[PDB]
């Protein structure tokens, strides 16, 4: 399923923001967009 790896990616985005890595959080955000834009 795509749901597990999506959740893990989403959790990395959240963790990066909580630890002050905001810029890197935005780059992971872009990956979420591109991933869900697929089939």
């Amino acid at each position: 399923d795509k749901l597990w790896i999506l959740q893990k990616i989403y959790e990395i985005m959240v963790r990066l923001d909580e630890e002050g890595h905001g810029e890197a959080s935005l780059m992971v955000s872009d990956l979420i967009y591109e991933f869900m834009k697929r089939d």
Partner: protein
């Protein structure tokens, strides 16, 4: 009776892109030729700003919001991306002007400016000039979310969290979109050389 372009470009607060602001401008005269300096970066997809001073329109709409620097290229006709699809969408036949400028010193904050957000999840693309300000939990899987974020149940908006130390591609940019509407009605917005 001059058009209030100063309240648009030089405004203190700017909206988030998901809740982009629209200011209807009418019943006034404006000098579009001075808009080459109204720091900036602008592109008109219809006639030049000089020819805009010769034309009149029923209403002029000014849309304004903040996004990342690397997302400004999405504020153009025929573009796709996170912003174009889910936040602010221009039609393929857009013939107005797009103006954007770096706003790092105003919209970034040490520790992060969490006021500005964008929509990351949506069940379909936006139609041109559609606005979506809903905050329903996006259900990515088949289990219900019951109105609370959790596994595969994501709050649909994400913050940019702008910080002064971001790379220029990730710094905030204030964007102003001018669209020119000609209805079957008195054209009450004219240029300088009209």
């Amino acid at each position: 009776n001059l058009c209030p372009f100063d309240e648009v470009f030089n405004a203190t607060r700017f909206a988030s892109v998901y809740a982009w602001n629209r200011k209807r401008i009418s019943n006034c005269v404006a000098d579009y030729s001075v808009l080459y300096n109204f720091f900036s970066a602008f592109k008109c997809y219809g006639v030049s700003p000089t020819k805009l001073n010769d034309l009149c329109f029923t209403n002029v709409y000014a849309d304004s919001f903040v996004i990342r620097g690397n997302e400004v290229s999405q504020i153009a006709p025929g573009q796709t991306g996170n912003i174009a699809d889910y936040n602010y969408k221009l039609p393929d036949d857009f013939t107005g002007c797009v103006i954007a400028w770096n706003s790092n010193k105003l919209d970034s904050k040490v520790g992060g400016n969490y006021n500005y957000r964008y929509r990351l999840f949506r069940k379909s693309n936006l139609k041109p000039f559609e606005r979506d300000i809903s905050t329903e939990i996006y259900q990515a899987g088949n289990k219900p979310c019951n109105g609370v974020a959790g596994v595969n149940c994501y709050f649909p908006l994400q913050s940019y969290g702008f910080r002064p130390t971001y790379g220029v591609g990730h710094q905030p940019y204030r964007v102003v979109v001018l669209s020119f509407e000609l209805l079957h009605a008195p054209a009450t917005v004219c240029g300088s050389n009209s």
